[PDB]
Task: structure prediction
Amino acid sequence: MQGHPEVIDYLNTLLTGELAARDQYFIHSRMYEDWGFSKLYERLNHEMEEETQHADALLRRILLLEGTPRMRPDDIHPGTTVPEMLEADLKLERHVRAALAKGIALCEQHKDFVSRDILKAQLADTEEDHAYWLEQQLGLIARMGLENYLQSQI
Amino acid sequence: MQGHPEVIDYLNTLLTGELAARDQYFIHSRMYEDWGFSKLYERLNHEMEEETQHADALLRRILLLEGTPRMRPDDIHPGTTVPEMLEADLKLERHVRAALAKGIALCEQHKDFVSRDILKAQLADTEEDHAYWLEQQLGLIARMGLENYLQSQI
Amino acid sequence: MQGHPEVIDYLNTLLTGELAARDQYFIHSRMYEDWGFSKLYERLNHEMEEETQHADALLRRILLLEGTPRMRPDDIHPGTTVPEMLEADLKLERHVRAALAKGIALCEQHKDFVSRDILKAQLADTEEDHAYWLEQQLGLIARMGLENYLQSQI
Amino acid sequence: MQGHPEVIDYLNTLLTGELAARDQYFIHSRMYEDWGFSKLYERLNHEMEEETQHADALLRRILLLEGTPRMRPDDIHPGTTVPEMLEADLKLERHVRAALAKGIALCEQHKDFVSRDILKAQLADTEEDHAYWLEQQLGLIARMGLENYLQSQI
Amino acid sequence: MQGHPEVIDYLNTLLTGELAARDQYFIHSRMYEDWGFSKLYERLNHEMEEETQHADALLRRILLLEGTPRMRPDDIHPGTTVPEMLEADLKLERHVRAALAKGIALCEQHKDFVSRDILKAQLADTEEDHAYWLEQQLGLIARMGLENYLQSQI
Amino acid sequence: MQGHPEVIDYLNTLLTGELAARDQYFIHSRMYEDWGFSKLYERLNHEMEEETQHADALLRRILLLEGTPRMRPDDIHPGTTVPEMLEADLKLERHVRAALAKGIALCEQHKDFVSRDILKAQLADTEEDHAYWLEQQLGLIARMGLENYLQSQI
Amino acid sequence: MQGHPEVIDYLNTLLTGELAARDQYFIHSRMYEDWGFSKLYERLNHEMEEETQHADALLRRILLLEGTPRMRPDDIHPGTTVPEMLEADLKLERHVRAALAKGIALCEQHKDFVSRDILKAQLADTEEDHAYWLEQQLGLIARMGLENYLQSQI
Ligand SMILES: [Fe+3]
Ligand SMILES: [Fe+3]
Ligand SMILES: [Fe+3]
Ligand SMILES: [Fe+3]
Ligand SMILES: [Fe+3]
Ligand SMILES: [Fe+3]
Ligand SMILES: [Fe+3]
Ligand SMILES: [Fe+3]
Ligand SMILES: [Fe+3]
Ligand SMILES: [Fe+3]
Ligand SMILES: [Fe+3]
Ligand SMILES: [Fe+3]
Ligand SMILES: [Fe+3]
Ligand SMILES: [Fe+3]
Ligand SMILES: [Fe+3]
Ligand SMILES: [Fe+3]
Ligand SMILES: [Fe+3]
Ligand SMILES: [Fe+3]
Ligand SMILES: [Fe+3]
Ligand SMILES: [Fe+3]
Ligand SMILES: [Fe+3]
Ligand SMILES: [Fe+3]
Ligand SMILES: [Fe+3]
Ligand SMILES: [Fe+3]
Ligand SMILES: [Fe+3]
Ligand SMILES: [Fe+3]
Ligand SMILES: [Fe+3]
Ligand SMILES: [Fe+3]
Ligand SMILES: [Fe+3]
Ligand SMILES: [Fe+3]
Ligand SMILES: [Fe+3]
Ligand SMILES: [Fe+3]
Ligand SMILES: [Fe+3]
Ligand SMILES: [Fe+3]
Ligand SMILES: [Fe+3]
Ligand code: NA
Result:
């Protein structure tokens, strides 16, 4: 079934963004492990798998709609310290959140309700799981201090 | 069996107080979880269930005594930080403690010994479980500092 | 992430309504049990738990959106006989249904699609589970008579 | 193997009748459930599955005999109340019974003994299971009254 | 709860379409089995069950909304060869897809968000399961030839 | 119990025909295995066992009726290639089908209803299992070509 | 421990190549599934996981050696048909093979024997698993024809 060219293009924009999110969590999780923070490694490794699934859902939907997926990831922007890395992932998730919301609006306008639902599932993941967890870590650092927070992530 | 109107009225006062305790633990537990303190969430979520059972015991006893339960909760007074929330719950439990003790005295005076025993069970919970645990947390903050205490509640 | 103030306010209106639904089922279920209708007790006790979960979902979403939840329940309006209690719960659910539908429209307008989905889940529960079951009981009373219906709920 | 054109045509008449029986039980069972009579729902849902199997046996036999099955169901005639629905299903089963008996006679005449046996299996189901159960329900309503009968089907 | 007459009417249009889809898969699956293609039989038998569930969801929703379901299936249009049957089912699913999308738009307009969600679930099934699988089979025939494809479906 | 001499004689005719069917499947199944088509071997080996049981039922019935069974099999007519062997077994089953139908008519005429039922069971096996499967194989060869069909039977 | 800058740079070149291999298998596997070749989907999905592990081993080794991993994947070059996709993956694996062999030589020269061993493990995977399997598929297409080969991958 041929999708609407505007929806396919916009799914392709989301796809290169999810491929990038996957890669930024790839490097941050391994950096965390390199420093001995295994709890941060585990969480961001898990989030890398989750972004791979988000990318996979977009890719498959684009193929079903007879589009050609764009496989070049967006640039990533890794941090160099634990607070910079948390902030960099939160900025990325906020960008994804905004992009998914605009995508849902576009899908509704072009009456592509299944693509809309696929983006809504990812939006809920972005807001209630990925971004929220990051806001919490930054909040924890603010409440107990960075040293105590890092101790808790060994 | 018709209870004494003074006992029924006083059980109704305790009931609106327990409905309020339930609700104050509802909001504090979720605030704790919002900030990433899952151990505080778990404990206050558990205490919300316990106040619901205390409310339930009062409600059922009022119905057995052919009274009409008053279902409007007392106002709650949530805190805005972990130490304010602990202090606010301790103040509420101290109020409940005093109210239950006065109720036991009233039940004894009106020779309603089963209602007295129901309040005694709740009084033991209030003093030895709910209030004591709160005093302990505040004591811990005083002994290791707030930052260390918060770290321990992640 | 800061939610839209209009959405947060409206979620807060829904929250005080769910806290009230929870409490009206609290008292009706116990009244049913007081009279010996254990099947009505079981169903409304189950519905009290369900409204507590609906309230919980709203409360958590409001906190995620950086709002302050309003914990005062709306007034309840319990019945005094089995048909009045069924009618009173149906009137409450119809009110909730209308309020949730208006909320979904508001969330769509402010492009808060995750809050919309949370309300849609609750709307489906309200229409297809809570309100429908009540309409059925009233329908049963109409078809076999109140005496037979009450016999069936022992 | 080419069947006798008269037998194939007559199997096709039975087939559109079974497709209709399936559909009339589809709607009646769901109407019963809509009203809260789950025991009537369960029985007629089960009978819908049974008519689907009766239809399936006829359809497959028609294909084996190199005919073309007629898939348009006969008109159905649902009732609007429990006694009308029982009467409407009994009238349909009595019609099926008569049609199957005439079919068995036709198959015997054209020496199609396997098609005869397939109709005999369905005739036994129609008389001893479907129609009999309906006659029993109507008999029960007559003996204990409609209100008591409906109570028993919740 | 009385639904909007325009939504009820449109659900009734979808219902007669699902009853038809169920019946077209009924006959095609049995034709496939008659020819010895058991893998096609299994898949279309499974899809017949799925359309029966789609019909059932619509029927129940119409009853909940106090409408009267229309139980006459749309005409079906079975093929006479494996490629015609695949094409005929794909044409039917494309028609259903378009009809469901228009229905979702109508439900949104009349603020019937639960009926909208029921259609969205069916739309996802239609696009991502039923229609996609058909497009794949036709694609396979194009890539390996009809003879090889038929061999693979024994 | 002495059977009718005409029925006994006719059962004896069917018996020598079943002994022959058993033997023709004996040789064809082993020829299929000799060539490496193990799926054809398995099916015709299974059908040899089934004809042995059909023969056994006739033999025992003849003895019960105090007749003397005729144990000389009819001549068989094996094919020399897979399509000739399928055609030769289909011709044999069509002959058996016709002979069983005439036998059922004869049994009905002589009011030997148990012998009739024994032949009806075998007739259903002949039409719906043995002959149908053969027609299907020949149909498959016609649809995918003989080479592909043979590949599928390895 | 600081690695040799020339080795770190060369590991970084291999890393962007493995990230690309991972992505080319990502898209090809999903394209294969889109067309209904589930065996090709399964194999290339498995190879995507394997390249992710190869990338992960390089990334971690670069961090251990105190380098900064380069996370931008090389360009990929997906095919548009099954033979083009197989050829495109074989060309990529041949490039990886050559790059790994040059890397092993470089590591030996700089006496980084553990990095050498990590590349040797990946080289064995590339030659004996990934590239060999691709050569086999192309060989199969050449021996039985593309149509038969595609049939075998459903
Ligand atoms: Fe997760
Ligand atoms: Fe997660
Ligand atoms: Fe994502
Ligand atoms: Fe998640
Ligand atoms: Fe994310
Ligand atoms: Fe406890
Ligand atoms: Fe406790
Ligand atoms: Fe208490
Ligand atoms: Fe306790
Ligand atoms: Fe307490
Ligand atoms: Fe429930
Ligand atoms: Fe419920
Ligand atoms: Fe609710
Ligand atoms: Fe529910
Ligand atoms: Fe509710
Ligand atoms: Fe049955
Ligand atoms: Fe039955
Ligand atoms: Fe029937
Ligand atoms: Fe039956
Ligand atoms: Fe029937
Ligand atoms: Fe399925
Ligand atoms: Fe399916
Ligand atoms: Fe459907
Ligand atoms: Fe499906
Ligand atoms: Fe469908
Ligand atoms: Fe068998
Ligand atoms: Fe057999
Ligand atoms: Fe036989
Ligand atoms: Fe058999
Ligand atoms: Fe036979
Ligand atoms: Fe492997
Ligand atoms: Fe491998
Ligand atoms: Fe590799
Ligand atoms: Fe490998
Ligand atoms: Fe490789
Ligand atoms: Na082949």
Remarks:
- Residues F 50, 125, 129 surround fe (iii) ion (ligand 29) (CB under 6 Å).
- The interface with chain D takes residues 19, 23-24, 26-27, 30-31, 33-34, 55-56, 59-60, 63-64, 69, 71-73, 75-76, 78 of chain E (CB under 8 Å).
